[PDB]
Design a protein around this nucleic acid. Structure first.
Lengths: 129, 134, 139, 52, 117, 50
RNA sequence: GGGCGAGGCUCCUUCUGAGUUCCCUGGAACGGGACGCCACAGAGGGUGAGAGCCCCGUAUAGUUGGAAGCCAAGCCUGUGUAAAGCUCCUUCGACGAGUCGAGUAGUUUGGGAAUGCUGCUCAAAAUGGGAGGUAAAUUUCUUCUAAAGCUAAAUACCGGCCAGAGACCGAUAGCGCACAAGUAGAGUGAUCGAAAGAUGAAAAGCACUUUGAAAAGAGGGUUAAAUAGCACGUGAAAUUGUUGAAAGGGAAGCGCUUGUGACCAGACUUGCGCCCGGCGGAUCAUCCGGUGUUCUCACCGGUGCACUCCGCCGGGCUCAGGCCAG
RNA sequence: GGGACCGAGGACCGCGCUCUGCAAGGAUGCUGGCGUAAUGGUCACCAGCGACCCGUCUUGAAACACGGACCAAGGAGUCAAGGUUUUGCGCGAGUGUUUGGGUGUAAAACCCGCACGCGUAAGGUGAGAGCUUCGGCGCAUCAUCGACC
RNA sequence: AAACUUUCAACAACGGAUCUCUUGGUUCUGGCAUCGAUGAAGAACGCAGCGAAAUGCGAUAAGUAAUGUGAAUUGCAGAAUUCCGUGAAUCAUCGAAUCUUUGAACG
């Protein structure tokens, strides 16, 4: 879609930022992120901390977690590993538990400034069903 | 703005009460300002108009015409002042109605009842002037 | 931070108190707008760096934003009045808008606005008499 | 002004919201040396010459 | 479920802020008649009946005759000093007796009683 | 933290300075404001019927 | 325990701010321009047009006078071996009948342990009776006292005495009724039930003359307006009359394209530059001081004094200028 | 060689060639009359050619049938309750202040106690978006193999 | 050529749309509780200097007493009011009265 259905002015700035990055850079990461920004909310399901903790269990540590959705909290996870997560939104419990474990929280414009190619990024989605 | 719940700011209720007023309420409505000389004498701004009063017209086409009040026509909310008249077709002199808000009282018909009216208004003006001062 | 020139444009693109539009075009009443067109380029109030030229008694009055004093509207405008030859007014305005990278894209519009103001302060020529025309109007 | 931070702390079930962007200045974000060093060279200009 | 004439029996509560003002002025009125006294009587602390609400506790109707006597409050004086009395309720355990005796004692410590005329 | 200047009754600053509250850093969302203002303006309304 | 009772609270009542300042338009400022002033009052209305200060009111506290309920500081008296609360106990402790209940019929309820009610037939009890819990071993246990009675509040409200409001309607709308509307009118009757607001600021609602039997008409007059004549604000369309232009050998009306006739909107009226002269002036370049700013750009004051800068006039030249064409 | 219709774009860039520039990524040069109803436009009429009277209903379609004297004003998928799909928003294992209470500049706005409604209390291979230190890591999910209640 | 029929314009008619107004309606909220045998609600007949209706009143009849305000009513006529006053008024308030025939209607 040419125009996002959202009326968020900050989402419009993110679409403009990632339109320039998808046009001028040959990285297919930027094209995927731009596509997911255009999708609706039911097509952007939440991703809990326990699901991304599954995906850093192997050698995927020290890689930036990128989720084009809002990251929730799981009460079933007793310990949260140190991790660097970039997302559209974070809940208060998810942001507090990541920062208590020693990690850091980024927005998608901070990810663009830090990793414009999406280098060493572990990209995730939530459960569709 | 208004504060008290007994007051109303309704336009139709205000217009109904004005045009359906009794003649006693119509007397208070037909009040005219006092002149500058009379204002510094009695400390009174305005008084209800009277049949023996002497007025000067300061608004209308008959501006600066001075004469004695001859009638207070409370039905049409007008006063009749002497020599401020127009002629009908038949050469008959009929008086022109002037609202009391367009005239200024330059002399008063004074009886015992008017003197209480000047006294009661004067008492409240210096009451608050002393209240504002000290 | 939360606010920027890009964000203010998104809030005020559709409706603005300076905005006037009717069919043929969309204009702007902003004093910081030069060419009086509604766009991000000429939106003086939106942009951090902007220029605006208003007429004086004899000459032009050029105002510019100071970026450090953006939250102090009583001292946010750097005002210079050019009451001299038109050539020196144009040169100083061009230097004001292009030498130090303060809106070099607006240099042409700034010089063109100073010309149009000073073209309005010349004495006006009397209009030629209207000619009655045709059989009906002449007779 | 001194009391404004206390009245937003006392709102129960509400915290001041976190924005989905960190820097709203898109000019500094695009023209930064991080983005531009990564960028591939332009294919064209703003307006292109008519060929045939 | 509109088989009856619901259009002639439908209540809209547009007087919701008006009745709130009426209720607050009724509370203000009884604070003017009883100026230093509270506008409410003291009420006992009871346990909710059923097994769903055993763990929770609430205010009951009035104090029992036995817990009123153990606290030192006479029967015929308690309604005169703002204490509700329930002749139907029974203590049936020492736990309900001890909590209400302590509640009546705390009311006595905070009470100012004026010497008749 | 940024600070703001306090001005006296004469219009001149008095030298007192206080920190800017954190609510001034909240996001500016005209979509949320218009959605709330539409519902807020309806809550004053008074019924009419035939 | 009784009787007086200052005073107080409600509610009606009198009184309480500031421009009719100067110009112009206007029949009339309440319009515009300038100068003010009041504001716990910039709600509303009236006044010859949109008025905080012309007038009534409006805000806040006081301040006059009055009505009726209730409270009440205090002041007089009380009284009789009079009433009252608790305590203890080798003394007592009365509690509602054609009513419960059983059978039956009808009705009702989510409710045959009949959910309630009513009629008929029969008709009770006293460690009793009623309703429940329970397989738990026998009706164990739980909780209340029916057939007499009173009692404020929280609840309802298309009516009564008022009051305040609306993102409601604006004379075919809104109640049937903005008007001498449940009227006029219709029906034997029960009942049915309309249509109908607006001159003007002020009637100043045509004096007088003239024609006509009169109704009316024409002069003249009132008004800012008779293009506001009580067949009255503005005054559409259907339909009609007069005048002006035109068309028409058994339909008109419509589409494309010229022509004739009538009537029109634009466009143009000169601008820019350069070169010679002649006037009027030094905001010419540079440099020096302050100020600002984008920190190298400007402004202001001086220096600048006249091959430099800016206006005006008089000539000449270039370029660009409208419509139709070769 | 003789005609007809058209001139689209608007600094340079390109592909080429008959070379002091060319006909090569779209028209310039010279000249005349007029500078106003002259071109142009709007009505009225004549002339050449074209052209059933609308709507509804039936049917494969017509035809029949019905409504249509004219004008002005009025005139018909609305509100509520309960379900359901999608889009936007807030918070998110939670969410819902507005029954009520507390303030108020008083039917607004602001704040909130206890309950309550709805929900909540483990991979491989073919792959597979994406990342890569280019050795491999591999989201969601499908085919299948799975593990458990 | 006129007339007639049709089209357009102007002015004049017919008619009452549009626009502007509104002492009306509609809906919501708030304070309070008050008809009658001491004769109600309703029905009738009378009463003004000049009134038919609407309104008010009841043979004391568009009204009397009392209280308050303080100089009118008004379409016309006539008195007024001595105006330094028990005091005008189609005034307001309202605690005293008058109150025809009926109607629950009661010789």
């Amino acid at each position: 879609r040419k125009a996002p259905k959202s009326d968020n002015v900050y989402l419009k700035l993110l679409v403009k930022l990632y339109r320039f990055l998808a046009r001028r850079t040959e990285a297919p990461f930027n094209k995927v992120v731009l596509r997911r920004l255009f999708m609706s909310r039911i097509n952007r399901p939440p991703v809990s901390l326990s699901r991304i903790a599954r995906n850093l269990k192997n050698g995927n540590e020290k890689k930036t977690v990128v989720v084009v959705a809002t990251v929730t909290d799981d009460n079933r996870l007793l310990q949260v590993p140190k991790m660097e997560v970039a997302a559209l939104r974070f809940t208060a419990k998810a942001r507090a538990r990541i920062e208590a474990a020693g990690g850091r929280t980024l927005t998608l414009d901070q990810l663009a400034l830090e990793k414009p190619t999406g280098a060493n990024t572990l990209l995730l989605r939530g459960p569709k069903n | 703005m208004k504060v008290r719940p007994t007051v109303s700011s309704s336009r139709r209720k205000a217009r109904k009460a004005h045009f359906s007023a009794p003649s006693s309420v119509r007397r208070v409505i037909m009040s005219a300002p006092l002149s500058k000389e009379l204002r510094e004498k009695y400390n009174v701004r305005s008084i209800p108009i009277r049949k023996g009063d002497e007025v000067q017209i300061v608004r209308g086409a008959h501006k600066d015409k001075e004469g004695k009040v001859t009638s207070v026509y409370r039905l049409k909310y007008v006063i009749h002042v002497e020599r401020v008249t127009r002629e009908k077709a038949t050469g008959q002199t009929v008086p022109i109605g002037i609202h009391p808000s367009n005239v200024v009282i330059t002399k008063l018909h004074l009886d015992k009842d008017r003197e209480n009216i000047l006294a009661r208004i004067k008492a409240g003006r210096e009451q608050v002037a002393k209240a504002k001062g000290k | 931070s939360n606010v920027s020139a890009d964000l203010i444009w998104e809030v005020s693109r559709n409706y603005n108190s300076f905005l006037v539009k009717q069919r043929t075009g969309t204009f702007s009443r902003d004093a910081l707008n030069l060419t009086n067109q509604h766009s991000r380029k000429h939106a003086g109030f939106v942009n951090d760096k902007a220029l605006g030229i208003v007429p004086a008694e004899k000459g032009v009055k050029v105002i510019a934003k100071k970026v450090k004093a953006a939250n102090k509207p009583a001292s946010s405008l750097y005002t210079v009045t050019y009451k001299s030859t038109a050539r020196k007014a144009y040169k100083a305005i061009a230097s004001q808008a292009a030498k130090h990278g303060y809106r070099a894209d607006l240099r042409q519009a700034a010089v063109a606005r100073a010309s149009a103001i000073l073209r309005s302060q010349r004495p006006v020529k009397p209009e030629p008499p209207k000619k009655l025309r045709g059989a009906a109007a002449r007779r | 002004i001194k009391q404004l931070d206390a009245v937003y702390e006392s709102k129960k079930g509400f915290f001041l919201p976190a924005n989905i962007v960190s820097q709203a200045d898109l000019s500094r974000l695009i023209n930064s040396t991080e983005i531009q060093s990564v960028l591939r060279a332009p294919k064209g200009e703003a307006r292109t010459k008519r060929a045939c | 479920h509109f088989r009856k004439h619901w259009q002639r029996r439908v209540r809209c509560h547009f007087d919701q802020p008006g009745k709130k003002v009426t209720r607050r002025l009724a509370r203000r009125a009884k604070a003017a008649a009883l100026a230093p006294r509270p506008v409410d009587k003291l009420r006992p602390i009871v346990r909710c009946p059923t097994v769903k609400y055993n763990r929770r506790t609430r205010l009951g109707r009035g104090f029992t005759l036995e817990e009123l006597k153990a606290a030192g409050i006479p029967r015929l004086l308690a309604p005169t000093i703002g204490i509700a009395v329930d002749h139907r309720r029974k203590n049936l355990s020492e736990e309900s007796l001890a909590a209400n005796v302590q509640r009546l004692k705390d009311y006595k410590a905070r009470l100012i009683l004026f010497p008749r005329k | 933290r940024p600070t703001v200047t306090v001005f006296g009754a004469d219009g001149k600053p008095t030298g007192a300075t206080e920190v800017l509250p954190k609510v001034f850093s909240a996001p500016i969302r005209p979509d949320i404001v218009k959605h709330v203002h539409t519902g807020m303006a309806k809550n004053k309304r008074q019924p009419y019927a035939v």
